[PDB]
Amino acid sequence: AIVALVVAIIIAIVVWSIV
């Protein structure tokens, strides 16, 4: 769901961003 995406999307983006 929208929440799931945000969680993962935010997790990935945030993570991927980190390194």
3-state class (DSSP) for residue 19? coil
3-state class (DSSP) for residue 15? helix
CA angle 14, 1, 6 (to 5 degrees): 15
Side chain identity, residue 12: A
Burial of 9 (C-beta count, 10 Å sphere; 0-12/13-18/19+): exposed
Handedness of CA 15, 13, 9, 7 (dihedral sign): positive
Q: Report the alpha-carbon distance of residue 18 to residue 7 in Å, rounded.
A: 16
| CA separation, residue 3 to residues 10, 12, 19 (Å) | 10, 14, 24
Side chain identity, residue 17: S
The approach used to solve this structure was NMR
